[PDB]
Design a protein that fits this description.
homodimer; alpha/beta; TIM Barrel; eight-stranded parallel β-sheet; two-stranded antiparallel sheet; 10 strands; transferase (chains A, B); DHP_synth-like (chains A, B); Dihydropteroate_synth-like_sf (chains A, B); metal ion binding (chains A, B)
Amino acid sequence: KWDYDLRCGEYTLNLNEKTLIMGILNVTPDSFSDGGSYNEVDAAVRHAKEMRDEGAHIIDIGGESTRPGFAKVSVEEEIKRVVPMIQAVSKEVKLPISIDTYKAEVAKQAIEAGAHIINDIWGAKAEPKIAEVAAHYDVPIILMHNRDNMNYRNLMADMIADLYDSIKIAKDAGVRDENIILDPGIGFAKTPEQNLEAMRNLEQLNVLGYPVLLGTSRKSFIGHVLDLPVEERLEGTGATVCLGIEKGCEFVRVHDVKEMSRMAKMMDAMIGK
Amino acid sequence: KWDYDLRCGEYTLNLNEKTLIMGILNVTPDSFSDGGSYNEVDAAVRHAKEMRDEGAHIIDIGGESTRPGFAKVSVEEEIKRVVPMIQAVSKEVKLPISIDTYKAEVAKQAIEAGAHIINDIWGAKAEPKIAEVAAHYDVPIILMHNRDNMNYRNLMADMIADLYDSIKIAKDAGVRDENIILDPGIGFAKTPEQNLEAMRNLEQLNVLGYPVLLGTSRKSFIGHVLDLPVEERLEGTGATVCLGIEKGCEFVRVHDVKEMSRMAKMMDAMIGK
């Protein structure tokens, strides 16, 4: 299937063995500090250890500026928060770390503090220098589908075109094919019905020739279908993980590592991965 | 998709709206009685009500002779147990009832006591008169794939051939096409690796032109893949339910109605059912 492994500093991720589980770590900020506090960093570390024990292969770390909060915050603030988290987790948890940012300087500091993968919800379109950061450090970058509108002509054809535009930015900066990962940006810039249409047609992304990460965990469109609140979306998230693996996804990004890691492993066995 | 509904006495099941959820009710026999006791029947009724409240569309009722126990028991004994259960559940729970038996006389009594669907784990091969019972009463019958050996030449081609042999028995008895449902008999007469091979190739059953029920709930092969005991197979069962719906199954037979009914409903929305 894939004729290379994803190279991640001291770690290596095989793309053929198994669906790779990316566990989500959102910062719980301490009031009274701008970052690096005991309660805040220790909560991150404990959470990353639990996700490791439950089957995570990557730990995805996000500051305040990114999902789910989108706090308007300066890069200098975002770095006081994320850097301490990355330093502690990387030392204490033996797994590659992705940094969830669309900001080039936040990416550059995170990698220096120990992060191995950039995860960009804007696909190098909000800050094209992030791809130069990726190129220099020679790390994998995940380019997610996103736009500032939902005026689509043809949902899937436009997603592929938009993702191409990210690939071109990355490649023009020096990013090697082997360090490109794509993500359909489910739950971004899409109506509920479009999110479902994209799930139904996900296998089309594979024609671009890159590994695909699916990130649907606890998203609004699941609530829209099941009419359930965020804490009762486990089964709905599971359905999307399974349909994703069936349609060829190499990664899933999830909050509930124990459960989705068992679902992934069952799916892998069924489809023959 | 389907140009008829499944007719079930006062109930009607649409095959195009949604994946139909069949909730499993295994009898908990009272010691000291051969059947019809308060504790035993009331436990059945309470369970069928819970499964109704959680989203079941059919209640599947099984005596001692069938799965998971396979107790060697006379038909006259099996009827003292199952009939009281069917009478009480049908009166108290407004949903069609399937009877899980391979015995023609057990089928005939269950239907008379109120059962609407025969569910035969031997596909009319253990007792061909069950198809005559189905034909007379004009009820749906589910013909499951089974054999007394795993000497397969070509797993899937042989499954289709064997299921045909059931269809022919049913049709020769007077069973109308619209009352035939098929089931791949996952977890029967197959090695773990064959159960996974059958899951991977399930869509092949659709060429026979009948609705397909998938029944994988808590089965051994899930434990084999995940190395987990029967009570920790929810996620693994979920994976099989999702892959089944994706591959065209019209029914799933499950123990955990709440969870699998949310997974089914998410899948339906994604695939456009």
